[model samples]
Target: QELGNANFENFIGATEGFSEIAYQFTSHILTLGYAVMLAGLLYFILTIKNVDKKFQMSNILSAVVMVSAFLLLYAQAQNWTSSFTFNEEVGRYFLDPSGDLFNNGYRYLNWLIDVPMLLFQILFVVSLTTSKFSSVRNQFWFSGAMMIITGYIGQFYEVSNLTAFLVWGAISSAFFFHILWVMKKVINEGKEGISPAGQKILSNIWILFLISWTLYPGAYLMPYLTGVDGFLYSEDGVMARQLVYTIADVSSKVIYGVLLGNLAITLS
Candidate 1:
């Protein structure tokens, strides 16, 4: 009995250590992904010929601003040590040099970095919405505002209710659809064209990767749908969180990798 108990303790210790390592690895992958995406955007803007300078510049600026905010927020999130060790949510952990310098310095720094990055992201979307290239300006602006407000509410209140998720899911899906529509419009308008070879390669790559991303939200929502009965709510909900986060990491890395590869081809 004594030997068995000791072995069990050792196994538990190993599991916890591995879990921490997995979290850090996933975070690192996301950072690298964003870096690649940024490189791709820069190259695409600088090299792609015959595209309208004004339109290209607007897109390049928006992409730069959007990616910068994402990198900042991602870096902050990765730096913060999560408080939920082994599934117990103790008081939150903050990243170092945070705005709450006096209290738990890290926590305050996270809030400061996150808030402004979030604001910038909203502005980035708003800029895109009002851009001359965009057709669904009003709808995009409304969706953008709704997303920003919902994000603020979740951040300030810790209110991760189903309603919030529903609104969020709807807004995100709408944005993706609108972006697809815009891409179609640009393709049709003779605004610009990729070489046939480039178009074939990118279309295949983008379609496969983007479709996977579109499916992920549903995968994430599966837990809620399954938990209509309260019996297994707490137990299964935690599993859902882990699965959703995993899906996000995997999907994002794939898309970022594709973006970088596509950019290299465009540049060459």
Candidate 2:
């Protein structure tokens, strides 16, 4: 009975921040990102008529399939989370529902953005592969491989293993290099002026997103390399975790969630 009471105390302590407010914030930002992406997708579909009919349909089908899969997965995940009540009796469900929700709900949201974005990227590659727009098609294979590798690296990060850090860091460098090369080629070919207005818009939006994403690596590495965590954690572990937690909350939920989500929609 005493042990049960102790567990209950811990559970209630953890439930305060994870209330309706967090849910609202998550849903609002996520939906807004997807809406922007849907608009971009529609814009692409309208422009698709200029391409060959067969290629156009393939592109449209791939986009639809990917979006549908993401929705299905997201909905099911939410349902699973909702099954548990935030109470002492539910134990760490109030704190971190690893079994029911997976890694305190972090894994699910990661999947939400990543799974669909991946499919959308595949669609983009397929479109490029068949495009009469030789400039885009020229780098299709390399870019496609980079995108896939990046998605896998994202999965690696969520597991929070040290091995994931090195693996993903390497993949990140490769992906960045590939993207820079493609952008360089496009600029050097003087095809920027030749692309349709819609393509230009998409590319511009993507560039803005990339700029924001660059901040994540810088923010994380800067403090770690300076040994900021060593001083704080050695003196007071509780305070150190709180500091790291705050940075993580802002970066992952707000910055990456909004910027990276917007970029995925551009691919759509």
Q: Which whole-number lDDT from 0 to 100 does residue 181 have in model 2?
A: 65
* Alpha-carbon shift of residue 144 in model 2 (angstroms): 3.9
* CA-lDDT, candidates in order: 0.39, 0.40
What are the per-residue Cα lDDT tens digits for candidate 2 across 139-258? 545564554455445434432443564466567566656655654444334323333543554455345435543443443233234353353222122223223333343332334333
Per-model TM against the reference:
0.45, 0.45
Clashes of each: 7, 0
Worst 10 residues of 1 by lDDT: 2-11
